[PDB]
């Protein structure tokens, strides 16, 4: 089992990266659970001498039953530079 967590400031990039990972897993005959959207993270900087807000969007994808071809394909995936990805194996 390959669990994938994505984070980005831009939700447009995160949904595209997520769809791209899902598709890739499916094309190589794996099972996918998700995408699972998690609640957006909301941080704020108070400007002194007025708020600046940073939101971090979050998505999870579980790949179940990764094939030889699944991992190989994930390694070759060209993911947008603004999306951070974390992977843990089962």
């Amino acid at each position: 089992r390959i669990r994938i967590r994505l984070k980005a400031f831009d939700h447009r990039l995160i949904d595209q990266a997520t769809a791209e990972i899902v598709e890739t897993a499916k094309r190589t005959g794996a099972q996918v659970r998700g995408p699972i959207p998690l609640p957006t993270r909301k941080e704020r900087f108070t400007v002194l001498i007025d708020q600046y807000e940073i939101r971090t969007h979050l998505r999870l994808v579980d790949i179940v039953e990764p094939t030889e071809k699944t991992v190989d394909a994930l390694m070759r995936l060209d993911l947008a530079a603004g999306v951070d990805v974390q992977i843990s194996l089962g």
Binding site: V32, R33, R41
Partner: protein, 120 residues
Amino acid sequence: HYRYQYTRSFAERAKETESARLRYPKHIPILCEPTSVRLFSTRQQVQRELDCNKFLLPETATVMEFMMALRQRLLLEEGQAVFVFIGNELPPNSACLGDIYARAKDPDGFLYVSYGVENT
């Protein structure tokens, strides 16, 4: 499949849901287990058993209501979300348990659900 189906005979699971439906014919019996061998411990079995939660919820209850019941039962903190799956699919929050049950119930009478907890 699910741990509950390996450790309980079909006969006892079927009887269990038969009794539930005889008394509560408009309720849905639900069996939830986590989405999750020299990897063994004397603790492993009791802890796996305690991860399995059963519910008996109205057919008119929504997925969201179920998820809130599961949250309460798992006593999750502020930084924790629970998400649920039916056979790899994540059901819509406004779906009724009775509609999901009609389509996805096991032959033994339970609606089987995988849950994952995420620590946002």
